[PDB]
Design a protein around this nucleic acid. Structure first.
Lengths: 898, 69, 69, 69
DNA sequence: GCACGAATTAAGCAATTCGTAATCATGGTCAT
């Protein structure tokens, strides 16, 4: 517990600093910072450039003096060495040592809003009245829902939690009780006092980080722009503690979003946090989808516009917003993302918003590590954005890979940069570089004997460790240190759990249990008789230590993995194109070289010649088909599938792994690089079930496979674990039953035999018509109907939806239903030949139900239709054909011919 | 004046880039009296021309001095 | 900028190079082309692929600078 | 040739938004007065040719531009 | 990309290639 910063800004020449004092109370200091910069010098000094040149410091009265000095030295073309972002400099000088923090005293705000909008408006174009107030707090852990008692768009009853805490039938709204007590409420006479008290809440309850699902794309713009259109510049500024709250807009290819920054508070979206720090790919990045992914607490699925819900059944309306915010809070509880940003920005000594762009996240850490040796960073120059070779993927043969193993590289670009010794100042000219194909085959001549090399022909020093590799190491070993701490902590937790179930005693003493170190066996033995209370407190301390270790491990991983995307970003400070095209092209040469060596060893062991054993691969991971070795040894000699997986497991370690090591040491020798750091172990083993006809995995194209994975990262699976990517099993345009059937067909075609996939096709054909018509039918957007109508008949290239809607309008003309116009999303399905409507299509507003009079025939005239050939049979054929099989048995006379 | 055919294509853009990559950025700036040299890309046009603007010497590309006059 | 932000129009030049030349000479300027050193240069470089002016990977092996004076 | 170059590249400036004497009204007035002039001489030459040749409703101008007939 | 900045020029399409439909000639077989 110490003093630290919550947000830093700079106005004029004074730098404001929202911070937590040593006592624990938020303060808003503001000091006259004096910039300290650096310049070229011909005189020896302790302050040196990265190249070793002598550098002279300088201290300045005010920041504006430095910003004039830069313009001075930028008119004679002399490098203005030293940090030019005073915010980073201030944090470094203000704290210097490693900063110990406490998330408990930082005020994060979770907010979601729901406007009284009949038609969904633009975030910056406000035309509908705001009614939802939500601002969950961390240091206060209390909701804020002050119900708009009466408004200009009607009056509503009071929101009472006691009646809404039960189930819908009982009068409640399926929202948990333990969160309802958090909610507050007070009435309102209009929206003016609501806005007034909201801005007040912003004043007295001033958050540190303002987050929420898509907060920067919806609530922030809408909330501020309504205040602007109504109140004006007055009160709108109060949002920022210093008043520098500045109109910021970002024109985009999608249109005009007024991406806004509230000065003095870091507006960190949560949607981008999940999009960036999770590596999880779910097709629907809407909040409820990821919630069901993580917390599984889906809402009650009732459809229709919620305008009537605002006045009538407003209790359910408010409960929707309550669970909306609780979903994001639960996502935080399960991932701890804001914990990660807090733990990372203090490590990089930079403002919180910096976590977004890694350019800063590295420009700060390499600086504050270069401060120790008194070395001084260089002025940012000016480069040009260039497209150069990047990632690499082999062309897989769309075949049925039966018994296949896989490996991956532990960290591609960090290890590349360490091994080649690539840095902005470790560059020493080029050599002659032949076409890449020659180097992969190994016949090409050794490029040099004095320096390290990369196959784009630039030669870099060896002995002098670069700044970039040294920083990568200072991150890598810290990562492994914290990981070892976490392993020791989990071992200790297991030991304590095993202690609590045998023996007991009464001893309420709680000594200073050591931290950051595994406890001695005697020390944990002497407190074995601690009953449960103090033992549970110790276990809670162990869990808290595990949480800090986890945060440290994740933030370390993200950092090391981002050095590349930084080093190729034109606006990085240490950018150099040669450096970039020497760590990507070396990646391609490394993967193709290891592929060549895999083939050269597998053709040798198996016996065949000119056989490509690599099934597929990215630049860092490869899948190699190993069916030939399994055939050589024999399938029948085994007794259980576990024997098969164990053989495939130890075959990589005993035989393949040393070959990998030697064939990458040959890379290290080829260009005489510094040292060998690449790793490669069996990331996944795919194998068909023992005895079953099952394919056991197949490819379809570049990066669309399917595998019945049985072992992932040395974790035996008691049951088959399905692993697919790029297939058509997750696209939103198909119904859930269609996707479930597709995934079951995958499970069959992989694990089960042909008869299984054959009979399942017809079973699902029978069952497929036995679902609701609306879920099966797709939806399209219809615009410009008048272009393609002639008395309801098809026009010139009349779209499916247009034809369907014209026929529907001809069907129910004058029947009183709402007309279907342009711009409305309309659900469409075809009809069989000879339907009474005279056309092979039908269309009506989505979600809505068509009139009952035409409901019968449209159901009868679409029975056993062909539409699922356009939905499910086509993808099934696309997979099965590449799987060496066909679903519907094409019987013929072939057995008579032979 | 520093003319020549395609001077702002494969001449200035290369001479300057090479000396920057083999002799460091400091000696490359000796090309100008003011000692101030700059580069701006023009992706607006399909051609990515990293055109340079050495101060003191009026870089006049003869190709573009000919297509105009 | 200080005067513009109040919403009034400034008069004169904003780019002072023309202003300086105008005041320094004013009357008609008499010049002899001979004294103006007009260089000229074409560079030839050799490489496997087309030498990329921006990547600048190959070795400059013919410079052939020309001078007028 | 200097004078020729100066005059020829004038309308390429008064019709530019960064030439300080820019107006939409003027930039359109020059263009469409040119249009009116060319079509006016087109109609007059048609009338004169019809009168001298006696016939009526005969079109002789072909494929002109805002300068040529 | 921080902190702006201080000045500013490439527009709008002619042409091809492909896919899908719409219309139109033309043949195979049938009630006659």
């Amino acid at each position: 517990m110490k003093e630290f910063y919550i947000s830093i800004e700079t106005v004029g020449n004074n730098i404001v600093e929202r911070y937590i004092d040593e006592n624990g109370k938020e303060r808003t200091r503001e000091v006259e910072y004096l910039p300290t910069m650096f310049r070229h010098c011909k005189e020896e000094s302790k302050y040196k450039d990265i190249y070793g040149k002598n550098c002279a410091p300088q201290k300045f009265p005010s920041m504006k003096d430095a910003r004039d000095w830069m313009k001075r030295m930028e008119d004679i073309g002399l490098e203005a060495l030293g940090m030019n972002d005073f915010k980073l400099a201030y944090i470094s000088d203000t704290y210097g040592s490693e900063i110990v923090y406490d998330r408990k005293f930082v005020r994060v705000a979770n907010c979601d809003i729901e406007v009284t909008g009949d038609k969904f408006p633009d975030p910056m174009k406000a035309e509908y009245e705001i009614d939802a107030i939500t601002h969950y707090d961390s240091i206060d852990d209390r909701f804020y829902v002050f119900d708009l008692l009466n408004s200009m768009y009607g009056s509503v009853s009071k929101w009472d939690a006691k009646l809404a805490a039960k189930l819908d039938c009982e009068g409640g709204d399926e929202v948990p009780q333990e969160i309802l007590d958090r909610v507050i409420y007070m009435p309102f006479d209009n929206e003016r006092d609501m806005l007034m008290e909201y801005i007040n809440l912003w004043e007295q309850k001033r958050p540190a980080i303002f987050t929420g699902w898509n907060i920067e794309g919806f609530a922030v713009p809408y909330i501020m722009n309504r205040v602007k259109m109504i109140l004006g510049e007055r009160s709108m500024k109060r949002f920022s503690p210093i008043g520098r709250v500045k109109s910021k807009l970002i024109q985009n290819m999608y249109g005009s979003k007024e991406i806004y920054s509230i000065d003095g508070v870091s507006i960190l979206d949560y949607l981008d946090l999940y999009k960036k720090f999770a590596f999880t790919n779910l097709p629907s990045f809407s909040l409820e989808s990821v919630a069901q992914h993580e917390t599984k607490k889906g809402k009650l699925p009732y459809d229709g516009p919620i305008n009537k819900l605002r006045e009538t059944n407003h209790q359910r309306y408010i409960s929707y917003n309550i669970i909306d915010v609780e979903s994001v809070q639960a996502i935080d509880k399960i991932r701890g993302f804001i914990d990660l940003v807090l733990s990372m920005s203090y490590y990089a000594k930079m403002p919180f918003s910096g976590v977004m762009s890694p350019i800063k996240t590295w420009d700060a850490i390499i600086f504050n590590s270069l401060k120790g040796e008194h070395k001084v960073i260089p002025q940012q120059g000016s480069h040009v954005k260039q497209s150069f070779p990047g990632a690499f993927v082999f062309e897989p043969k769309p075949i049925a890979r039966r018994y296949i193993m896989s490996f991956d590289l532990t960290s591609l670009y960090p290890s590349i940069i360490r091994q080649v010794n690539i840095s902005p100042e470790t560059i020493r000219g080029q050599f002659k570089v032949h076409p890449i194909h020659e180097y992969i085959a190994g016949t090409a001549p050794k490029p040099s004997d004095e320096y390290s090399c990369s196959p784009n022909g630039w030669m870099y020093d060896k002995h002098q460790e670069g700044i970039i590799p040294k920083e990568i190491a200072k991150v890598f070993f810290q990562r492994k240190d914290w990981k070892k701490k976490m392993f020791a902590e989990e071992m200790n937790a297991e030991a304590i759990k095993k202690i609590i179930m045998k023996g007991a005693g009464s001893c309420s003493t709680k000594p200073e249990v050591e931290r950051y170190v595994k406890f001695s066996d005697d020390f944990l033995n002497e407190l074995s008789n601690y009953t449960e209370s103090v033992l549970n407190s110790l276990i809670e301390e162990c869990e808290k230590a595990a949480t800090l270790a986890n945060t440290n491990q994740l933030n370390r991983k993200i950092l090391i993995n981002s050095l590349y995307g930084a080093l190729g970003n034109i606006h990085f400070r240490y950018y150099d194109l040669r450096n970039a095209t020497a760590i990507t092209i070396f990646g391609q040469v490394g993967i193709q070289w290891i592929a060549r060596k895999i083939n050269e060893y597998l053709n040798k062991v198996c016996g065949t010649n000119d056989e490509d054993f690599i099934a597929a691969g990215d630049t860092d991971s490869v899948y190699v088909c190993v069916d030939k070795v399994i055939e050589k040894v024999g399938l029948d000699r085994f007794k259980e599938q576990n024997d098969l997986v164990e053989f495939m497991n130890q075959f990589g370690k005993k035989k393949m792994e040393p070959m990998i090591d030697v064939a990458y040491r040959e890379l290290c020798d080829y260009m005489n690089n510094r040292e060998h750091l690449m790793h490669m172990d069996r990331e996944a083993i795919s194998c068909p079930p023992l005895g079953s006809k099952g394919v056991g995995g197949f490819w379809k194209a570049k990066k669309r496979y399917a595998l019945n994975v049985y072992d992932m990262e040395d974790k035996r699976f008691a049951e088959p674990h399905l692993k697919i990517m790029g297939m058509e099993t997750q696209q939103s345009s198909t119904p859930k039953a269609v996707q479930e059937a597709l995934e079951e067909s995958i499970r069959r075609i992989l694990q089960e035999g042909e008869e299984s996939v054959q009979e399942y096709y017809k079973n699902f054909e029978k069952e497929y018509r036995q679902l609701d018509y609306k879920v099966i039918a797709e939806v399209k957007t219809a615009n410009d109907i008048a272009k393609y109508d002639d008395k309801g008949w098809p026009g010139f290239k009349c779209p499916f939806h247009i034809r369907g809607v014209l026929t529907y309008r001809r069907a129910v003309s004058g029947l009183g239903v709402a007309p279907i116009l342009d711009g409305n999303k309309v659900m469409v399905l075809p009809l069989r030949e000879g339907n009474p409507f005279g056309d092979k299509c039908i269309a009506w507003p989505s979600g809505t139900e068509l009139p009952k009079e035409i409901r019968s025939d449209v159901l009868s005239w679409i029975d056993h239709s062909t539409l699922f050939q356009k939905s499910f049979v086509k993808p099934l054929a696309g997979m099965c054909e590449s799987a060496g099989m066909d679903y519907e048995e094409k019987a013929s006379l072939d057995f008579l011919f032979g």
